[PDB]
Design an enzyme around this catalytic site. Structure first.
Site, PDB file in Angstrom:
ATOM      1  N   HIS A 125       0.933  -1.127  -0.089  1.00 26.06           N
ATOM      2  CA  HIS A 125       0.108  -0.194  -0.022  1.00 26.06           C
ATOM      3  C   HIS A 125       0.833   1.234  -0.216  1.00 26.06           C
ATOM      4  O   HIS A 125       0.452   2.509  -0.119  1.00 26.06           O
ATOM      5  CB  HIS A 125      -1.074   0.135   1.050  1.00 26.06           C
ATOM      6  N   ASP A 168      -1.218  -7.130   1.968  1.00 31.66           N
ATOM      7  CA  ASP A 168      -0.360  -5.824   1.829  1.00 31.66           C
ATOM      8  C   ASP A 168       1.129  -6.395   1.879  1.00 31.66           C
ATOM      9  O   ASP A 168       1.434  -6.054   2.956  1.00 31.66           O
ATOM     10  CB  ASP A 168      -0.898  -4.843   2.918  1.00 31.66           C
ATOM     11  N   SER A 209       4.663   2.318   7.660  1.00 30.74           N
ATOM     12  CA  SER A 209       4.293   1.053   6.966  1.00 30.74           C
ATOM     13  C   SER A 209       5.400   0.385   6.179  1.00 30.74           C
ATOM     14  O   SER A 209       6.366   1.128   5.851  1.00 30.74           O
ATOM     15  CB  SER A 209       3.132   1.581   5.926  1.00 30.74           C
TER      16      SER A 209
END
Ligand SMILES: *[C@@H]1O[C@H](CO)[C@@H](O)[C@H](O)[C@H]1NC(C)=O
Ligand code: NA
Lengths: 252, 28, 28
Positions: free
Chosen positions: A43, A99, A198
């Site tokens: 992502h 992801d 992330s």
């Protein structure tokens, strides 16, 4: 990283910074798994609702860094991406299932005290280590609070959470390629990953061989360090087969 | 082969500030 | 490359994470 502490030098040598070419901005973290291969969240690289769709020529990776911003001459190496591989079943509409993404460096990075790859777990390492109550480690130059940038690499130790508890903390559907970690609201401690964290790795140290294993990838969460919320991590072992495939096929 | 082992810690027989917190967690 | 550029910023911005913005983390 919220409620983290400053990393030591060379404490997390697999830690990678994912850097946007133009304009220059920090995108998210990632991890070195070999001299040519980098593992981040998908992502970070692609998220249609925000018209986000990078390619091999949009991005740079910075390896061996400690200061977020400062250029670290004769320490950090920068590399260019040859190929990007996002997971085929990565669902960005609903809950960021799968992801995960792989990036191949054009040239193989050289290893220093500052640059060194992390281990990926095999079946039993995953089964021995990844258990609720057991702590892992999260690293990044992400934000310090849910909206604030850190000066240098931030690090935090977060306990893994019982799947029940993950599921009854949210309305979002928790697939089997996720696990969650963090403190309960009266566990007294706290801390979470945050924006720009992330893709960064969630690692644990094997008590059998002193090796570090990347168990999860920082994926998602409802805010940052919210009471009675946890952080969600791509289950690296579940996705081992895809990783295996992408490496054995593409990139000889 | 090389992997998982930190040049400035494991390889120099040395512990970072918060490793212990992780091990202790395996015991509880 | 690695060739003193001084044309790479040392003052940039951490971007925006869709990851942190799911569910209750959705922003107005
Ligand atoms: C994103 O951009 C690449 C490069 O142009 C394109 O080939 C790919 O299909 C795009 N993916 C989507 C669905 O936006
Ligand atoms: Na929380």
């Amino acid at each position: 990283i919220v409620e983290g502490s400053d990393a030591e030098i060379g404490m997390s040598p697999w830690q990678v910074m994912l850097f946007r070419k133009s304009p220059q901005e920090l995108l998210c973290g990632a991890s070195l798994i070999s001299d040519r291969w980098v593992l981040t969240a998908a992502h970070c690289l692609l998220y249609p609702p925000w018209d986000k769709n990078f390619t091999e020529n949009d991005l740079l990776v910075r390896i061996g860094k400690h200061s977020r911003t400062r250029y670290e001459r004769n320490i950090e190496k920068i590399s260019m991406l040859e190929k990007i591989y996002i997971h085929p079943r990565y669902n960005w509409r609903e809950n960021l299932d799968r992801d995960i993404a792989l990036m191949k460096l054009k040239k193989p990075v050289a290893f220093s005290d500052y640059i060194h790859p992390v281990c990926l777990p095999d079946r039993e390492t995953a089964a021995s280590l990844l258990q609720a109550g057991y702590k892992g480690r999260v690293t990044g130059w992400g934000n310090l609070k849910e909206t604030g940038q850190p000066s240098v690499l931030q690090v935090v130790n977060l306990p893994i959470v019982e799947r029940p508890v993950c599921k009854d903390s949210t309305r979002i559907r928790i697939t089997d390629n996720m696990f969650c970690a963090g403190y309960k609201p009266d566990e007294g401690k706290r801390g979470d990953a945050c924006e720009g964290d992330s893709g960064g790795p969630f690692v644990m140290k094997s008590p059998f061989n002193n090796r570090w294993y990347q168990m999860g990838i920082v994926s998602w969460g409802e805010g940052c360090d919210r009471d009675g919320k946890y952080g969600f991590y791509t289950h690296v072992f579940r996705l081992k087969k895809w990783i295996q495939k992408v490496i054995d096929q593409f990139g000889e | 082969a090389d992997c998982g082992l930190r040049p400035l810690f494991e390889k120099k027989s040395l512990e970072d500030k918060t490793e212990r917190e992780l091990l202790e967690s395996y015991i509880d | 490359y690695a060739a003193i550029e001084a044309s790479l910023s040392e003052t940039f911005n951490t971007a925006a994470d869709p990851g942190r913005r799911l569910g209750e983390g959705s922003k107005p």
